[PDB]
Amino acid sequence: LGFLGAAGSTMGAASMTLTVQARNLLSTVWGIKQLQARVLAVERYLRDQQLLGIWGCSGKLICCTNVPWNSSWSNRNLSEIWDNMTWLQWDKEISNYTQIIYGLLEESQNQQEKNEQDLLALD
Amino acid sequence: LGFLGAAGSTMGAASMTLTVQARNLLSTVWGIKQLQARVLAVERYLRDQQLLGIWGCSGKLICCTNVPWNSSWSNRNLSEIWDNMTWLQWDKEISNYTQIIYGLLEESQNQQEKNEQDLLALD
Amino acid sequence: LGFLGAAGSTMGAASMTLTVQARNLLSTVWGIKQLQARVLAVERYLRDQQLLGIWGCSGKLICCTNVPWNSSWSNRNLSEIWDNMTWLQWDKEISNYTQIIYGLLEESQNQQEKNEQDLLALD
Amino acid sequence: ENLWVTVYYGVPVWKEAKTTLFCASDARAYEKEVHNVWATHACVPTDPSPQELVLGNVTENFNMWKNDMVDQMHEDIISLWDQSLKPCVKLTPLCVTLICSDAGSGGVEEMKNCSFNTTTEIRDKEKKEYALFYKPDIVPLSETNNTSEYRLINCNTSACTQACPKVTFEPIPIHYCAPAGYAILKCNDETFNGTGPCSNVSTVQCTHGIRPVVSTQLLLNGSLAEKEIVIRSENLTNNAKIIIVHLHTPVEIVCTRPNNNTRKSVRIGPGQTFYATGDIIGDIKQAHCNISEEKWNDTLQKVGIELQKHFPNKTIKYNQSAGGDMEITTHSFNCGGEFFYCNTSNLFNGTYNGTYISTNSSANSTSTITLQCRIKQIINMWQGVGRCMYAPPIAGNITCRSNITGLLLTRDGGTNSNETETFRPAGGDMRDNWRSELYKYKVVKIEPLGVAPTRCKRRV
Amino acid sequence: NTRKSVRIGPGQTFYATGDIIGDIKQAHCNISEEKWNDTLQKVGIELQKHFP
Amino acid sequence: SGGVEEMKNCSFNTTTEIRDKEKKEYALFYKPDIVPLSETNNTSEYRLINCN
Ligand SMILES: *[C@@H]1O[C@H](CO)[C@@H](O[C@@H]2O[C@H](CO)[C@@H](O[C@@H]3O[C@H](CO[C@H]4O[C@H](CO)[C@@H](O)[C@H](O)[C@@H]4O)[C@@H](O)[C@H](O[C@H]4O[C@H](CO)[C@@H](O)[C@H](O)[C@@H]4O)[C@@H]3O)[C@H](O)[C@H]2NC(C)=O)[C@H](O)[C@H]1NC(C)=O
Numbered sequence: 063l064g065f066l067g068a069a070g071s072t073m074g075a076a077s078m079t080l081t082v083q084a085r086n087l088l089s090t091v092w093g094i095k096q097l098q099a100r101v102l103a104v105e106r107y108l109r110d111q112q113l114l115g116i117w118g119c120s121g122k123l124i125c126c127t128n129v130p131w132n133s134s135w136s137n138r139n140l141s142e143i144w145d146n147m148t149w150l151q152w153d154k155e156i157s158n159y160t161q162i163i164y165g166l167l168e169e170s171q172n173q174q175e176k177n178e179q180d181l182l183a184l185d
Numbered sequence: 186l187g188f189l190g191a192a193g194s195t196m197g198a199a200s201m202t203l204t205v206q207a208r209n210l211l212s213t214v215w216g217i218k219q220l221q222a223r224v225l226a227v228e229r230y231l232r233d234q235q236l237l238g239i240w241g242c243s244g245k246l247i248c249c250t251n252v253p254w255n256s257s258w259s260n261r262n263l264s265e266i267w268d269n270m271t272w273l274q275w276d277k278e279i280s281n282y283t284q285i286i287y288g289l290l291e292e293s294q295n296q297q298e299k300n301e302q303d304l305l306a307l308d
Numbered sequence: 309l310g311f312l313g314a315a316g317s318t319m320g321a322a323s324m325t326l327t328v329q330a331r332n333l334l335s336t337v338w339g340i341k342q343l344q345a346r347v348l349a350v351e352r353y354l355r356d357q358q359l360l361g362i363w364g365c366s367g368k369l370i371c372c373t374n375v376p377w378n379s380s381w382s383n384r385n386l387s388e389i390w391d392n393m394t395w396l397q398w399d400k401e402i403s404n405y406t407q408i409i410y411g412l413l414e415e416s417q418n419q420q421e422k423n424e425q426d427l428l429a430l431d
Numbered sequence: 432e433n434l435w436v437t438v439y440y441g442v443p444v445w446k447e448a449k450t451t452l453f454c455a456s457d458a459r460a461y462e463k464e465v466h467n468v469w470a471t472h473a474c475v476p477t478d479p480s481p482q483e484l485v486l487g488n489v490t491e492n493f494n495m496w497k498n499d500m501v502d503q504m505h506e507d508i509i510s511l512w513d514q515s516l517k518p519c520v521k522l523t524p525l526c527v528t529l530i531c532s533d534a535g536s537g538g539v540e541e542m543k544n545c546s547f548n549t550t551t552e553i554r555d556k557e558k559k560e561y562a563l564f565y566k567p568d569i570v571p572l573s574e575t576n577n578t579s580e581y582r583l584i585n586c587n588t589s590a591c592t593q594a595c596p597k598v599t600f601e602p603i604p605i606h607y608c609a610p611a612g613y614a615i616l617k618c619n620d621e622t623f624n625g626t627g628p629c630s631n632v633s634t635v636q637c638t639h640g641i642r643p644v645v646s647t648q649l650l651l652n653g654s655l656a657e658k659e660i661v662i663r664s665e666n667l668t669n670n671a672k673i674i675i676v677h678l679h680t681p682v683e684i685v686c687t688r689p690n691n692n693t694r695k696s697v698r699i700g701p702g703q704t705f706y707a708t709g710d711i712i713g714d715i716k717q718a719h720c721n722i723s724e725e726k727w728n729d730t731l732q733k734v735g736i737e738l739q740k741h742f743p744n745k746t747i748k749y750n751q752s753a754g755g756d757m758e759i760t761t762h763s764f765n766c767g768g769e770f771f772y773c774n775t776s777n778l779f780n781g782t783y784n785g786t787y788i789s790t791n792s793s794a795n796s797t798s799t800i801t802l803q804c805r806i807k808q809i810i811n812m813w814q815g816v817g818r819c820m821y822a823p824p825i826a827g828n829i830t831c832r833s834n835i836t837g838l839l840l841t842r843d844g845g846t847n848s849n850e851t852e853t854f855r856p857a858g859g860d861m862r863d864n865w866r867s868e869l870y871k872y873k874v875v876k877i878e879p880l881g882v883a884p885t886r887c888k889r890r891v
Numbered sequence: 892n893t894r895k896s897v898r899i900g901p902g903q904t905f906y907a908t909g910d911i912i913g914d915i916k917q918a919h920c921n922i923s924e925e926k927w928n929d930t931l932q933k934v935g936i937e938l939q940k941h942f943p
Numbered sequence: 944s945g946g947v948e949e950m951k952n953c954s955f956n957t958t959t960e961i962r963d964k965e966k967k968e969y970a971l972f973y974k975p976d977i978v979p980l981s982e983t984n985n986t987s988e989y990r991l992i993n994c995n
């Protein structure tokens with residue numbers, strides 16, 4: 063199994079197949095197009111890894127955080143979200159507020175790590 | 186806060202805007218300059234991540250090490266240097282004194298890694 | 309020491325010089341040749357870092373795993389390897405048996421990954 | 432009971448986007464010492480195992496009249512054509528007044544002799560040379576009825592560039608691949624009318640082999656259909672949109688020629704030598720194309736029985752192309768480096784009124800359709816931005832035992848109280864060929880980061 | 892008048908001036924007087940800050 | 944028309960689309976574009992200013 067193996071399946075079934083999806087990220091006139099495509103592939107991989115590495119989730123497929131979830135973003139219960147939707151529509155009504163999600167996660171990571179530095183310097 | 190949102194603030198105020206400043210290190214006559222700019226931005230960010238990962242601090246915004254601070258570099262206390270001067274003056278003071286700090290960090294990291302290797306091979 | 313400072317030296321001095329040999333992996337018609345060399349250099353380093361990242365050794369210069377070492381690959385004593393050899397003929401000895409090593413490391417990290425995955429949601 | 436944000440790496444979501452694309456040739460074209468006008472060495476070799484994955488329960492919207500891969504293919508082929516003529520002989524000294532007579536004794540009614548003068552190794556002296564030029568390449572500049580003076584046709588607009596006589600125009604297949612971080616959605620529905628939803632979407636990195644053949648009407652070598660004859664069109668209400676007919680079974684076609692002597696090497700400067708047609712040995716016959724009768728008849732009858740779905744209570748007719756110059760109204764292709772332009776009145780002479788007429792005669796296979804047709808040498812394709820090519824001739828006889836796949840029709844402007852809507856053939860822009868090959872594919876961008884609320888909370 | 896089109900070489904076109912219709916008049920450029928004068932005087936009063 | 948005083952007529956011969964034949968054409972070039980070729984005292988063998 064390779065890319066997008068549960069692209070139309072339910073949301074809860076997608077969590078058990080994440081190990082096989084994020085695998086292939088690096089593997090005249092037809093030289094310049096190849097060079098531009100290679101450069102944008104490197105840029106895409108580095109952007110995704112850097113954005114995963116800011117908020118303390120480097121090298122992990124599933125990462126839990128410590129920011130509360132506001133009810134003004136979804137206003138829907140957990141059961142129908144995790145057993146009814148595909149990822150496509152859920153991305154469609156989160157894409158209006160993903161920037162606020164990213165900013166809150168970044169600030170929560172910085173506060174947590176400053177608390178860790180103060181706790182380590184207490185000793 | 187913007188890209189350089191705290192450039193004249195103190196150390197205690199500028200240590201909280203790290204996460205909204207590190208986010209923006211990656212994001213025909215005039216169709217080759219853009220390509221050169223893409224490649225040099227990628228090289229700069231990868232050089233920074235290379236320099237951070239060598240002394241064992243990958244994916245950390247603030248890094249606590251075990252290198253003792255020689256007094257000849259600063260000759261100053263801590264409260265006034267964290268609540269009085271900005272990052273630019275302190276960088277201008279320490280800009281002569283950086284390569285020996287980087288070498289000390291590299292030596293201490295390799296010593297710590299060999300010590301941890303010996304301790305884990307003892308078991 | 310300098311670049312390639314202990315290439316002919318024994319195994320004991322080779323572990324004290326890993327932190328300097330990772331420095332130099334980064335540092336018209338000829339313009340496209342220069343961009344081709346630069347992009348292949350950055351891509352080779354990025355594939356190397358990703359390959360370190362697959363089997364759970366990202367950032368660390370010396371990484372211990374739990375793959376059992378089959379004796380048919382080497383058939384040599386431990387102190388014979390680490391006190392009477394340089395890296396070169398060791399590489400010529402092991403280089404036939406590299407893909408089995410890489411696959412075993414990858415599957416061991418996959419095993420530890422699903423252990424972490426079903427340990428996170430069992431408390 | 433509380434909700435916390437959790438990031439996920441590996442979320443399968445898509446965005447519609449455009450990106451630059453690869454070229455993936457095979458190893459079999461990698462070994463030849465000649466370089467064709469496309470690329471063999473420049474394209475990356477492909478793995479001999481196409482990784483195809485089918486999605487579970489997705490339904491995706493598709494369009495093909497607003498696509499980006501078609502425009503990228505068009506720009507790639509235009510740039511390859513304009514790049515494979517840079518280190519070639521520029522025939523700017525071939526603009527002299529030509530003195531032409533009949534083609535020796537026993538005139539051939541195809542060629543003129545057209546002897547000119549040219550510059551030798553000294554700039555001062557001139558020498559008399561003779562050639563053989565085809566009739567469409569020769570235009571009588573005149574102020575009176577002086578029939579002894581003629582000139583070449585491309586010394587009026589631009590260009591005058593000769594093709595390099597070591598490249599080939601053979602259409603080897605090229606694959607398109609998306610870069611890493613992208614994918615291609617491919618629709619496997621057999622009854623795909625061109626636009627709308629599809630329910631068997633598969634995700635593919637590298638597309639199947641595309642042969643970049645050039646043809647105005649009457650599509651040559653290509654991928655067949657799956658089940659039946661399929662009609663593709665943009666609206667089927669106005670008559671300005673070219674309707675593409677895709678066939679299920681192929682019809683054999685051959686096109687041959689009488690003899691020529693050889694390339695006659697004529698030198699026009701320092702190291703610049705062009706190869707015009709020399710003598711002709713043997714007799715003179717007409718170049719032609721041959722198609723089997725009954726295969727063409729029941730193929731057009733199958734197009735008739737399937738084409739009546741959009742026009743239920745009307746009969747359909749065919750006639751010739753609706754006028755213009757010879758370069759548009761005629762079936763044009765290339766074989767072995769020689770460019771054929773052919774009159775297609777004998778193929779589109781018929782009608783269907785709703786009564787299927789089956790045929791059962793195994794001894795009636797001798798009947799064939801012939802097409803009496805001509806050959807140019809000065810080429811002005813892509814209706815502009817072409818860099819007008821002079822294809823050098825080929826010595827021996829040439830045979831083009833081809834295959835046929837599709838038809839490019841159009842509808843005549845109808846009249847009131849009509850039940851006899853006619854369909855003509857038309858050529859036009861060259862986007863229709865690669866649009867009729869790339870109907871399946873759509874390029875798409877994956878976004879592997881997602882956020883979701885759950886009961887998990889990070890430890891402090 | 893026009894771009895008269897001379898043809899040179901195998902397909903090169905050179906555009907030149909053809910006839911002239913109407914009379915011949917001179918090509919001028921107009922500046923307002925008092926706006927120029929008081930802008931020049933403002934440059935003058937801002938230029939005496941350096942030279943005493 | 945005998946009263947232009949800034950543009951000359953400057954008739955010449957030129958190469959047509961056939962490089963064997965030449966034809967007689969005319970223009971109207973501006974006066975600073977043109978310098979006299981001083982092979983004689985005749986003020987009629989003018990030339991373009993970029994030709995050297
Ligand atoms: C649609 O699909 C068909 C099917 O492939 C294509 O038809 C092929 O067209 C190519 C050219 O476009 C043909 O290739 C030519 O074949 C000639 C005859 O080959 C016979 O003789 C040789 C020995 O001389 C045998 O080895 C061979 O097996 C055959 O028995 C050759 O004479 C040609 O060679 C010329 O080119 C080469 C390369 O530059 C030169 O080195 C030679 O000196 C010579 O000048 C050439 O190889 C091919 O035969 C056709 N296939 C068939 C089955 O007939 C159509 O082109 C394709 N497209 C269209 C638009 O119809």
Ligand SMILES: *[C@@H]1O[C@H](CO)[C@@H](O[C@@H]2O[C@H](CO)[C@@H](O)[C@H](O)[C@H]2NC(C)=O)[C@H](O)[C@H]1NC(C)=O
Nearest residue numbers: 534535536544545546559561562563709710711
């Ligand atoms: C085209 O004209 C040329 C001359 O203008 C012909 O070449 C002549 O061929 C005869 C053969 O009987 C020779 O005797 C002459 O010496 C040739 N004249 C030359 C080379 O200047 C040529 O044959 C004509 N083309 C054809 C197809 O007949």
Ligand SMILES: *[C@@H]1O[C@H](CO)[C@@H](O[C@@H]2O[C@H](CO)[C@@H](O)[C@H](O)[C@H]2NC(C)=O)[C@H](O)[C@H]1NC(C)=O
Nearest residue numbers: 569570571572573582584585586587588756960
């Ligand atoms: C030079 O090219 C022009 C087109 O740009 C020719 O003009 C027409 O050419 C067609 C094709 O032969 C003729 O049918 C028309 O009669 C031409 N004239 C017009 C007004 O459309 C032109 O003929 C070419 N020059 C010469 C000398 O033939």
Ligand SMILES: *[C@@H]1O[C@H](CO)[C@@H](O[C@@H]2O[C@H](CO)[C@@H](O)[C@H](O)[C@H]2NC(C)=O)[C@H](O)[C@H]1NC(C)=O
Nearest residue numbers: 975976977978979980981990991992993994995
């Ligand atoms: C090329 O020609 C121009 C045009 O005559 C020359 O320019 C004149 O040179 C003479 C001699 O030095 C001067 O007295 C004139 O003032 C120049 N200008 C004009 C408008 O006549 C020029 O010298 C020539 N040679 C070069 C450029 O090497």
Ligand SMILES: *[C@@H]1O[C@H](CO)[C@@H](O)[C@H](O)[C@H]1NC(C)=O
Nearest residue numbers: 070071072146486487488489
């Ligand atoms: C149809 O979608 C559902 C999603 O709830 C999935 O469980 C099912 O397997 C899909 N059907 C097929 C045939 O895959």
Ligand SMILES: *[C@@H]1O[C@H](CO)[C@@H](O)[C@H](O)[C@H]1NC(C)=O
Nearest residue numbers: 528530547548549557558559
């Ligand atoms: C071509 O060049 C020759 C060179 O001697 C000359 O005699 C002849 O008149 C020229 N023109 C034609 C039309 O042959």
Ligand SMILES: *[C@@H]1O[C@H](CO)[C@@H](O)[C@H](O)[C@H]1NC(C)=O
Nearest residue numbers: 485619620621630631632633
């Ligand atoms: C989808 O296409 C694949 C291609 O092999 C085929 O096997 C499968 O049966 C198709 N499914 C449907 C529902 O058409």
Ligand SMILES: *[C@@H]1O[C@H](CO)[C@@H](O)[C@H](O)[C@H]1NC(C)=O
Nearest residue numbers: 665666667668669670671672
């Ligand atoms: C083209 O199609 C659209 C909708 O499919 C329709 O509204 C429009 O009238 C059509 N064009 C013509 C000329 O009928």
Ligand SMILES: *[C@@H]1O[C@H](CO)[C@@H](O)[C@H](O)[C@H]1NC(C)=O
Nearest residue numbers: 748749750751780781782853
């Ligand atoms: C085809 O077009 C010609 C053009 O005038 C017309 O006369 C004729 O009726 C049309 N139909 C047929 C079947 O020839």
Ligand SMILES: *[C@@H]1O[C@H](CO)[C@@H](O)[C@H](O)[C@H]1NC(C)=O
Nearest residue numbers: 751757760761774775776777
């Ligand atoms: C094609 O053939 C028909 C009849 O055979 C003839 O009337 C016509 O002039 C020919 N040429 C074109 C360009 O249609």
Ligand SMILES: *[C@@H]1O[C@H](CO)[C@@H](O)[C@H](O)[C@H]1NC(C)=O
Nearest residue numbers: 750751776777778779780781
């Ligand atoms: C078309 O076919 C008919 C009969 O098959 C024949 O009489 C006629 O000459 C053909 N050509 C045209 C142009 O009608």
Ligand SMILES: *[C@@H]1O[C@H](CO)[C@@H](O)[C@H](O)[C@H]1NC(C)=O
Nearest residue numbers: 687688689690827828829830
């Ligand atoms: C024309 O070429 C084909 C190539 O297969 C050959 O079979 C045929 O005999 C040739 N024609 C003649 C008259 O030799």
Ligand SMILES: *[C@@H]1O[C@H](CO)[C@@H](O)[C@H](O)[C@H]1NC(C)=O
Nearest residue numbers: 652653681682683833834835
């Ligand atoms: C065209 O049809 C013939 C007849 O089956 C077939 O052998 C040939 O392979 C087809 N052409 C191509 C390019 O596949």
Ligand SMILES: *[C@@H]1O[C@H](CO)[C@@H](O)[C@H](O)[C@H]1NC(C)=O
Nearest residue numbers: 954955956957964965966967
């Ligand atoms: C220009 O060419 C024509 C004809 O070729 C000739 O009569 C004339 O003398 C030439 N020179 C000038 C200065 O007009």
